[PDB]
Amino acid sequence: TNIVTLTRFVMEEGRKARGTGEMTQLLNSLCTAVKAISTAVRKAGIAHLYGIAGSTNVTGDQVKKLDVLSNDLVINVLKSSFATCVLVSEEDKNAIIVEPEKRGKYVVCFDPLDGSSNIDCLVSIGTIFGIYRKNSTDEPSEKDALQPGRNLVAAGYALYGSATMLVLAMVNGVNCFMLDPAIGEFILVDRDVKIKKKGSIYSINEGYAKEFDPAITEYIQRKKFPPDNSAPYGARYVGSMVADVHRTLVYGGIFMYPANKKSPKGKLRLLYECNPMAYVMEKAGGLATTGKEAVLDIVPTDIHQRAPIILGSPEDVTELLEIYQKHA
Ligand SMILES: O=P(O)(O)OC[C@H]1O[C@](O)(CO)[C@@H](O)[C@@H]1O
Ligand SMILES: [Mg+2]
Ligand SMILES: [Mg+2]
Ligand SMILES: [Mg+2]
Secondary structure (H helix, E strand, O other): OOOOEHHHHHHHHHHHOOOOOHHHHHHHHHHHHHHHHHHHHHOOOOOOOOOEEEEEOOOOOEEEHHHHHHHHHHHHHHHHOOOEEEEEEOOOOOOEEOOHHHEEEEEEEEEEEEOHHHOOOOOOEEEEEEEEEOOOOOOOOHHHHOOOHHHOOEEEEEEEOOOEEEEEEEOOEEEEEEEEOOOOEEEEEEOOOOOOOOOOEEEOOHHHHHHOOHHHHHHHHHHHOOOOOOOOOEEOOOOOHHHHHHHHHHHOOEEEEOOEOOEOOOOOEHHHHHHHHHHHHHHOOOEEEOOOOEHHHOOOOOOOOEOOEEEEOHHHHHHHHHHHHHOO
16 A cells, blocks of 8 residues: 555655656656557557558658657656646657647657557557757757767657666666556665666677678687687577667676678667667666767767767677777
């Protein structure tokens, strides 16, 4: 009879500092969209929700029916939250400017459904988000979203896996909240999460081996044939960034979506995939790098810009950084 919900947690966090309560409103609103997306995902084949929507988005994906439903759900709850002023979504070509009567102080970048290729085979999928405070006095605009990830005030993701989890990072750390399907509340289940200094799992799509740079090539070979005769690392690649990053957080190890000979900036999108996961990882004591610089320090120039990303346990990411340095 004492439920420690995400709302309660975010309200006491706001308690400390000076707060207007907007961030609690924003996150309460997002939790409503996440529950509605989870329920749709959990019965998607009965509700006929698998399959395509009939379009392609700005970064070239085939749009799915669940992309359109999830996107509409998040845009509508954020607008109605009275906490936001600019929204960037994977699924919209341009930033969405909230109407004056509904504006609040925050800028939200999100991936309404991550793991597209895994939808129809029932593999874990998720929602990713990053929140900034608006920086200017100027009329809100797309440029308010073009901040480096270091300016995030909150970021995280929802994982629609064997259970639904909301992982939320803010200035003093990372906490995990599980959806209780019977009462429709996110309950705190893991407090102040910290990643292990060194793991034993590497996560990359090795189908790209022909295109990898020499540093990734060398690192993968080291994980399979360690020079010190330690046990080789195990390999995991679920193929949904939210699921592979969440395993990296709770088990340690490394996740990689690097630049390659065909994709100089990688595949994943900086504003609503890479920066939120880099922020979570740094708040959990991990690292997130392109191979040459910190993901959170990149100043974006395009809301749909791509970035390479290597993240996870700091000793594993540092070992790969040392290989890039060796090869530069
Ligand atoms: O099939 P690939 O090239 O390994 O891409 C998988 C990646 O693409 C995405 O689906 C893009 O959202 C990620 O969730 C996942 O990490
Ligand atoms: Mg997509
Ligand atoms: Mg995605
Ligand atoms: Mg997506």
